[PDB]
Design a protein around this nucleic acid. Structure first.
Ligand SMILES: O=C1c2c(ccc(O)c2O)CN1Cc1ccc(F)c(Cl)c1
Ligand SMILES: O=C1c2c(ccc(O)c2O)CN1Cc1ccc(F)c(Cl)c1
Ligand SMILES: [Mg+2]
Ligand SMILES: [Mg+2]
Ligand SMILES: [Mg+2]
Ligand SMILES: [Mg+2]
Ligand SMILES: [Zn+2]
Ligand SMILES: [Zn+2]
Lengths: 368, 184, 368, 184
DNA sequence: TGCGAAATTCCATGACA
DNA sequence: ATTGTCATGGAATTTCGCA
DNA sequence: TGCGAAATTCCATGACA
DNA sequence: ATTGTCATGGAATTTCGCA
């Protein structure tokens, strides 16, 4: 503080204060003639308070804060002190937006077999049709084969009703879903254990994680819409049609329809493919096993020029889910316990719990 | 002539009436001719209406070229005929009193009747709930003649629920005495 | 139809049917042995119906439709006929998404003088504070200097109340706004004509067009949020503080605060810049005129690799604004009357009116 | 010594009571010392409270270094003093009975009084509405001494509303007879 | 006439519901 | 008849202090 | 052994509220 | 304790029919 600054006025060299400028006194304050003009050099014991007053005016970031201070003051390495404050400002940390993108998405391997993995989800509410408001959508991961069930609510009870009917055909190893109330109930848990089905859940608020079914929801809504153009939105009676329509539609990239990947042979639907008419069912099933394994699989896209990837013990913040008006968009900083993969992490959270979250719902805390 | 495939022919038939279960009285039985895969639908009656309602569910998963049946009322109605024509499903009838299917089908249908009987004793009223587990059983049952179960022929893969302890399927001493006593 | 196909069976060459394949008869239909297998060659008079039946199964696009047809048929230039149908399918045209991006944004010139252009807009509803729910935000285009007025509704009546108070300071040439009810009322129209103010409106549903004020709304909400962290959201009393705070905050790219660009001198606020203490007001105002004209102006970004730009007489479709559940996202095709600029157009619309719309709210009709 | 700038000094004073207009009785007058720019705020009383309410509006646009006033009650209260100290605004008083401003200010204040009088005749009750047009007038008025209007000195640009027909500002024969008759 | 470190500038990211 | 914008904080780049 | 045109594949865009 | 996806229709590229 006054030690350093005394030492200075009497021409002696101090580290950080370049020698070529001269450092006088005036109005009882140490000043200096800098190219921009004369600036006060406050004692070190004053600088925290100053940086703070300047920052607090509009809770500004690095440069906008610096520019206010530089109006009156100069001292060695001002931005260091500015950044020190930014990193300690609770209000800035939990309100500002990130300016670093998530790392590139994972393209998880396609389930190996039909019934290996289901992705399930609800669509709705929709215009009431026969007193029904939602649709249970079940999509086989490997094939894309899709089942539709109209429900009155996105409830556990209705999910179980529909899934008992579906699983008469086959029981799946795993059922992946978002954390919707219907799927996270302990009744649904029992229902699954009862059948040796493993329940898999997306990280929270990250529907990309159910992308398989989500994407299929789009096709379902799109096709329903075209079918209802200029009629009252009476969709109940079309679910069966939409189901059959989509299960028998070609994926231009795969060159197969989910029905083909599921059965290896078209059923009696229009335009049925006849290419294996001469093979025995076994030769047919053998060609199907081949087709199945050799399907196009996309790869991780290039990282954007300014992505971040999570690192164990890093300070990161989870996005507030449904933030009230005028309230922060971010939770308080927390620590990365475990890097499950480059897009998924476990963090020790805002209260004191473990949470598995998508990198998409986090920002790295700025200024360390 | 071309080899036999799934969806070539669906054999359908009713079973019932059975004791009321959650409102239902009958079972529509569909069996795929090639694979022996079995679908079951509970109905309140053996009518064209109940048949169409049920077959609408199935035919929104796969459509057979041919449906085969006895000359049951429900299947001979011109409503049912109209329904099938609408879907380019050819209909096919065995002559009255003389029902012919196929060996595989006959035997399947036999298993279906027996296995049902075995479970609607002690709980003759609770079968509605059991129709799914019945189907999985039937469909993961090894076919002596073919190397494979119907699940395997249909989908071309093993099943996550194999039925390893292929069962008695015969009435144990206690069930005989309480089936010859339930029908009292 | 049968003419061409007769002509063909008897070995003679027809244009479109390559000579090296042989074209037999069977089951009363012309067939051909193609590498993939034997395909029926329907008569031309049948092909429209076929393409249609195939397309209608799931209202599929080009390849997925082709693949169904190719299952049974072959003929010359199948995709041409497929595309012909797609372009005529009302339901596909108004329901499908575009897959062509808008052309690169315009960076309009910064207004030359304070008061040349205002951008105005409402924020809210907000948590009730003293019975107030909205905020009128007025932003000077040239300077960014911003006025805030708390209102009970985003109404014309309140807009006029606030703007009478503001325009005691100066009257602006032009006031740009979105098409909100408050600004499009004929009362507001009168109010403006009464004062020789020109009313300028954004194209509809395109808030980027009011980007100046929109962007400032963000800063306002952001700063209010930080100031209200852990207190009840009592924002009424902070408007004045937020106003003063932001009007005196540096834009790091400009190196000026809206207050400086408005007055050329800081008022008695914390950290006031003192650099022109020795100039006369006139020398000061002279330096201000210089600062004003030489401010950084960004340029149009590179077009994305798959943008489209509107062309007079092109068929384009306006986005349905607030589309009901299960209804098309697009209006029927319409024609580009006039290209106002590369991002703005006039179209002859879905009924029979002229409309000025942003390119962002249009897709080019596919298949011509 | 450094040249004079805007925001260096604000001269404030009350005018009233006037005839009720939309509930209001007084006008707080703020004039910038350097520029002669004028702000006007309608109040219901000449109190510290009404002064603070009004000055809060203005001081959220710009803050003067010094406010100058007569020793009006409202300005000498320690509430008003606290208010100014809170904003690092130094307060400054002319000695009682002997009010000193500056030539520019004196003359401005004079125009303000006259121009008001000129419009609150015929409509002595409708002035509240007119305060904005009054200000624009005052602020786009050419200063004989300086080459510029206060708008131009404040903002450094021409105004979109220049007041080209600088007015009589004097009471025409009809107004004399109905002002010496309104105060009847 | 060139070094190491500070200062500045650049700029992608995201939010204005 | 009209049109995106700009605070932000790491990284990239330039400038500075000294020689 | 190379041309013009058709067929195929590529792939950015946008929506799953 | 987990993870984006894929129909779409112009453009880019490969293949085809003929020589
Ligand atoms: O389908 C849902 C859904 C949402 C929230 C909560 C749920 O439980 C949901 O099912 C939002 N959403 C649509 C959506 C939005 C953005 C995307 F990237 C994808 Cl893939 C899907
Ligand atoms: O501020 C408004 C607003 C909206 C609809 C209708 C109005 O009248 C509005 O004022 C949506 N919106 C926020 C918004 C969203 C996306 C953007 F790119 C920008 Cl710039 C701003
Ligand atoms: Mg969901
Ligand atoms: Mg969903
Ligand atoms: Mg608006
Ligand atoms: Mg807005
Ligand atoms: Zn802060
Ligand atoms: Zn269509």
């Amino acid at each position: 503080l006054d030690a350093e600054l005394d030492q200075l006025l009497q021409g002696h060299y101090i580290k950080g204060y370049p020698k070529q400028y001269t450092y006088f006194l005036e109005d009882g304050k140490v000043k200096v003639s800098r190219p921009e003009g004369v600036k006060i050099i406050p004692p070190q014991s004053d600088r925290q308070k100053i940086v703070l007053q300047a920052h607090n005016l509009a809770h500004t970031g690095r440069e906008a804060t610096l520019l206010k201070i530089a109006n009156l003051y100069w001292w060695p390495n001002m931005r260091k002190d500015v950044v020190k404050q930014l990193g300690r400002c609770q209000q800035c940390l939990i309100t500002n937006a990130s300016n670093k993108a998530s790392g590139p998405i994972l393209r998880p391997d396609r389930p190996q077999k039909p019934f290996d993995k289901f992705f399930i989800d609800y669509i709705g509410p929709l215009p009431p049709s026969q007193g029904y408001l939602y649709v249970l959508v079940v999509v086989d991961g490997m094939t894309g084969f899709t089942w539709l069930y109209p429900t009155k609510a996105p409830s556990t009870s209705a999910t179980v009703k529909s899934l008992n009917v579906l699983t008469s055909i086959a029981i799946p190893k795993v059922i992946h879903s978002d954390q919707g109330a219907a799927f996270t109930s302990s009744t649904f848990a029992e229902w699954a254990k009862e059948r040796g089905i493993h329940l898999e859940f997306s990280t929270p608020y990250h529907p990309q994680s159910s992308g398989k079914v989500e994407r299929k929801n789009s096709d379902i809504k799109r096709l329903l819409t075209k079918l209802l153009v200029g009629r009252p939105t009476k969709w109940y009676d079309l679910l069966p049609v939409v189901q059959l329509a989509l299960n028998n539609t070609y994926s231009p990239v795969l060159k197969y329809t989910p029905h083909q990947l599921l059965f290896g042979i078209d059923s009696n639907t229009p335009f049925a493919n006849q290419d294996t008419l001469d093979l025995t069912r076994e030769e047919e099933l053998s060609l199907l096993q081949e087709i199945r394994t050799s399907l196009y699989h996309p790869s991780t896209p290039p990282a954007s020029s300014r992505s971040w990837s999570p690192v164990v013990g890093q300070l990161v913040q989870e996005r507030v889910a449904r933030p009230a008006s005028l309230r922060p968009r971010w939770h308080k900083p927390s620590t990365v316990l475990k890097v499950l993969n480059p897009r998924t992490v476990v963090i020790l959270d805002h209260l004191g719990n473990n949470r598995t979250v998508s990198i998409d719902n986090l920002k790295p805390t700025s200024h360390q | 002539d071309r080899p036999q495939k799934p969806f070539d022919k669906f054999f359908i038939d009713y079973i019932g009436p059975l004791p009321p279960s959650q409102g239902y009285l009958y079972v529509l039985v569909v069996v795929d001719g090639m694979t022996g895969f079995t679908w079951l639908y509970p109905t309140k009656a053996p009518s064209t209406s109940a048949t169409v309602k049920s077959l609408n569910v199935l035919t929104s998963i796969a459509i057979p070229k041919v449906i085969h049946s006895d000359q049951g009322a429900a299947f001979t109605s011109s409503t049912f005929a109209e329904w099938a024509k609408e879907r380019g499903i050819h209909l096919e009838f065995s002559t009255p009193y003389h029902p012919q299917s196929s060996g595989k089908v006959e035997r399947k249908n036999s298993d279906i009747k027996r296995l049902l009987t075995k479970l609607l004793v002690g709980r003759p009223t609770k079968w509605y709930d059991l129709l799914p587990v019945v189907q999985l059983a039937l469909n993961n049952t090894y076919s002596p003649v073919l190397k494979y179960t119907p699940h395997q022929l249909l989908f071309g893969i093993d099943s996550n629920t194999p039925f390893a302890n292929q069962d008695t399927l015969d009435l144990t001493r206690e069930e005989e005495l309480s089936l010859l006593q339930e029908i009292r």
